[PDB]
Design a protein around this ligand. Structure first.
Ligand code: NA
Length: 355
């Protein structure tokens, strides 16, 4: 009966879904699960190698998956322009729904993950006032999230009883061995390099990030949120924010990261805005030495140190969201973000990404 198709299983959320779904006490259980991704390689889950952006390969790989009941859409193309983000991401989404909906007679629910950029315009009101809420109108700017929702909504009409849910996290704290968008990983690699070079963990970000309130969204809680919507009647045909239930300051998270690598913590330096891309320019050889000296997973810096992403997060103000609707609709999940941050650092170490 309960059969998951995780679309993007090698990603950060894909991985959390991959670990949690098959567990004995998981709601909706016991689950059979398929994990789909572009890579070959690498256990209870039924792996399918598929390129979602190829109409033929999606037709070939997903049509035979006759028994799936719930799809979890957690993949995204990231392009140079937003217009391209729409062409690319729509094509992918359509390709999966066109391969699944016709061929799965027990399809109950598609769960779509987007993000907090639903609420955020380019710049450039027009804008929204935080904390962000779910059902206040869409901003007038182009946004591939909006396009994905409309596709989903349109495709839900072509089968009766088929439900949907949208999941909108903020900045994700998580892990996967292959992630190419890992904030926590990225900060671990920066910390590791500072330790190696005998340098202080200088703060690489703005003041609003250092001293303001921020939140974040745990990879495992986001997975639980997806699962909740799969099984809860009050979650059906609704969009929802997912964040941790608490608030933090980078001022304090920086010390925690410092402590986890035994490196001197830096403080907010007035008079700049300090970037990871700049500080880590030319560190490719230094990283290889760290990987060799310690018996690490053989990685290149560009695959584990995603600086532009970390800078985008640490160089801007964090606008908070609201968990009221999720709670009101019955999702009482939370995380203690400082503890979760330590936990995801530990996970980077356990997989020998970082020493
Ligand atoms: Na956690």
């Amino acid at each position: 009966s309960s059969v998951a198709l995780i679309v993007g299983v090698t990603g950060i959320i894909g991985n959390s879904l991959a670990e949690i779904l098959p567990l004995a006490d998981t709601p909706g259980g016991p689950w059979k699960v398929y994990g789909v991704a572009r890579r070959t390689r690498p256990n209870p889950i039924n792996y399918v190698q598929c390129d979602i952006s190829d109409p033929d390969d999606s037709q070939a790989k997903l049509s035979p998956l006759t028994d799936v009941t719930h799809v979890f859409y957690v993949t995204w193309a990231n392009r140079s322009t937003e217009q391209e983000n729409c062409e690319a991401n729509s094509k992918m989404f359509r390709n999966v729904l066109d391969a699944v909906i016709p061929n799965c007679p027990n399809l109950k629910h598609i769960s779509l993950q987007t993000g907090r950029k639903h609420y955020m315009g380019p710049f450039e009101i027009e804008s929204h006032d935080p904390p962000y809420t779910e059902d206040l109108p869409r901003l007038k700017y182009m946004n591939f999230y909006y396009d994905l929702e409309d596709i989903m909504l349109e495709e839900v009409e072509k089968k009766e009883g088929l439900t949907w849910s949208v999941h909108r996290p903020g900045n994700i704290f998580g892990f996967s061995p292959y992630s190419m968008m890992n904030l926590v990983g990225t900060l671990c690699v920066y910390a590791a390099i500072c330790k190696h070079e005998g340098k202080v963990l200088r703060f690489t970000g703005c003041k609003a990030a250092w001293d303001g309130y921020s939140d974040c969204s745990d990879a495992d809680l986001i997975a639980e949120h997806h699962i909740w919507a799969a099984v809860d009647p009050y979650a059906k045909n609704e969009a929802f924010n997912v964040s941790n239930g608490d608030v933090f300051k980078w001022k304090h998270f920086w010390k925690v990261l410092a402590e986890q690598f035994g490196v001197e913590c830096g403080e907010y330096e007035e008079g700049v805005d300090l970037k990871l891309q700049d500080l880590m320019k030319g560190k490719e050889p230094v990283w290889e030495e760290i990987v060799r000296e310690n018996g690490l997973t053989p990685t290149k810096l560009k695959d584990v140190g995603i600086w532009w992403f970390g800078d985008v997060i640490l160089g801007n103000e964090c606008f908070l969201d609201s968990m009221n609707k999720s709670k009101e609709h019955g999702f009482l999940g939370f995380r203690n973000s400082k503890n979760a941050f330590i936990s995801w650092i530990d996970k980077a170490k356990a997989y020998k990404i970082v020493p």
